Amino acid sequence: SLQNNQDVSFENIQWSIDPGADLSQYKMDVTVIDTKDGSQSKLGGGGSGGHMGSGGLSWKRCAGCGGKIADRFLLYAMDSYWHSRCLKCSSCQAQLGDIGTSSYTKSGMILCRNDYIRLFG
Numbered sequence: 593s594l595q596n597n598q599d600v601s602f603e604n605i606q607w608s609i610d611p612g613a614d615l616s617q618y619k620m621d622v623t624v625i626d627t628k629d630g631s632q633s634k635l636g637g638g639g640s641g642g643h644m645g646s647g648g649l650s651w652k653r654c655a656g657c658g659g660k661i662a663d664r665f666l667l668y669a670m671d672s673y674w675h676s677r678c679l680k681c682s683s684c685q686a687q688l689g690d691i692g693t694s695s696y697t698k699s700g701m702i703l704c705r706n707d708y709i710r711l712f713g
């Protein structure tokens with residue numbers, strides 16, 4: 593007989609897996625930092641109705657535009673500070689901070705969930 597070959601490590605166990613659970617080493621944590629300044633409309637008249645002189649002139653430095661984050665919500669990727677327009681796919685340029693997509697990396701490039709698999713692997 594020669595009936596000694598069946599599927600034992602593939603389609604017999606076709607269960608659905610997490611979208612990048614084993615790619616944890618390439619995964620980044622998108623930390624969405626909330627700004628407690630401005631979420632209260634009753635706080636004051638923005639930066640006009642109230643003389644709130646702030647000593648912080650640098651705030652959080654962005655690694656995307658190279659300046660400082662003057663955006664509302666700043667996001668985390670890899671280890672640097674970002675915001676909506678800078679935290680995006682280097683292939684899509686789609687604002688990852690405007691989506692909340694758990695992007696991945698490998699060679700320093702920031703690629704979206706799907707792009708990393710298509711690009712590198």
Ligand SMILES: [Zn+2]
Nearest residue numbers: 654656657678
């Ligand atoms: Zn930026």
Ligand SMILES: [Zn+2]
Nearest residue numbers: 681684704707
């Ligand atoms: Zn992409």
